[PDB]
Motif scaffolding. Structure first.
Motif, PDB file in Angstrom:
ATOM      1  N   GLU A   1       0.804  -1.231   0.000  1.00 46.72           N
ATOM      2  CA  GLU A   1       0.000   0.000   0.000  1.00 46.72           C
ATOM      3  C   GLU A   1       0.838   1.282   0.000  1.00 46.72           C
ATOM      4  OE1 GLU A   1      -0.342  -2.287   2.575  1.00 46.72           O
ATOM      5  OE2 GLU A   1      -2.039  -3.433   1.753  1.00 46.72           O
ATOM      6  N   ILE A   2       2.120   1.146   0.303  1.00 47.43           N
ATOM      7  CA  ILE A   2       2.993   2.299   0.423  1.00 47.43           C
ATOM      8  C   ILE A   2       4.180   2.160  -0.518  1.00 47.43           C
ATOM      9  CG2 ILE A   2       4.341   3.668   2.020  1.00 47.43           C
ATOM     10  CD1 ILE A   2       2.525   2.627   4.227  1.00 47.43           C
ATOM     11  N   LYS A   3       4.315   3.123  -1.423  1.00 46.66           N
ATOM     12  CA  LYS A   3       5.350   3.064  -2.444  1.00 46.66           C
ATOM     13  C   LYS A   3       6.433   4.093  -2.227  1.00 46.66           C
ATOM     14  CE  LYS A   3       5.114   2.042  -6.574  1.00 46.66           C
ATOM     15  NZ  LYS A   3       5.821   3.336  -6.859  1.00 46.66           N
ATOM     16  N   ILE A   4       7.658   3.706  -2.564  1.00 45.27           N
ATOM     17  CA  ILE A   4       8.764   4.635  -2.591  1.00 45.27           C
ATOM     18  C   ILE A   4       8.687   5.357  -3.930  1.00 45.27           C
ATOM     19  CG2 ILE A   4      11.239   4.868  -2.662  1.00 45.27           C
ATOM     20  CD1 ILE A   4      11.486   2.572  -0.724  1.00 45.27           C
ATOM     21  N   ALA A   5       8.225   6.603  -3.898  1.00 47.77           N
ATOM     22  CA  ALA A   5       8.147   7.434  -5.095  1.00 47.77           C
ATOM     23  C   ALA A   5       9.539   7.721  -5.660  1.00 47.77           C
ATOM     24  CB  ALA A   5       7.412   8.744  -4.785  1.00 47.77           C
TER      25      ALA A   5
END
Lengths: 82, 82
Positions: free
Chosen positions: A77-81
């Motif tokens: 659910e959480i991405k490293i942009a």
């Protein structure tokens, strides 16, 4: 829902499941690898296992400090942009 | 929903709103303070403004590397566990 950033120090081999477990729960993990800083080949093995852990779970991986040596692993659910 | 970990290098004063804006969007921010590493009083001012930014927004704050000097700021939905 609420997500937590948890920190885990990898010293033993058991600590790798702890990390996996947190990501499974939807949490972010800052992993500190200092105990392994003076064991290059072992560090390489553990780092490889951590990247696999992230990929299998659909999450992300990246180094965040050089000292202490730290990587961050995220759940899907959480991405490293970039 | 999807949350992103974004990185921002604080050099100018404008970069502080960029950080604020991301947290408002629900994102996590790794803030790199290297441009300010050799300006102790300014570093202290900026660091104070960043902690305020987090608190006002209901989020969290913590240092993550000493070199590069980095702090992490979270939106209300994501907590730094302890």
């Amino acid at each position: 829902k609420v997500v937590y950033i948890k920190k885990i120090v990898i010293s033993t081999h058991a600590d790798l499941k702890r990390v996996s477990d947190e990501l499974k729960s939807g949490n972010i993990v800052i992993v500190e690898l200092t105990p392994l800083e003076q064991k290059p080949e072992l560090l390489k093995k553990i780092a490889e296992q951590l990247m696999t852990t992230a990929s299998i779970i659909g999450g992300d991986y990246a180094k965040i400090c050089g000292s202490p040596l730290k990587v961050i692993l995220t759940p899907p659910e959480i991405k490293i942009a970039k």
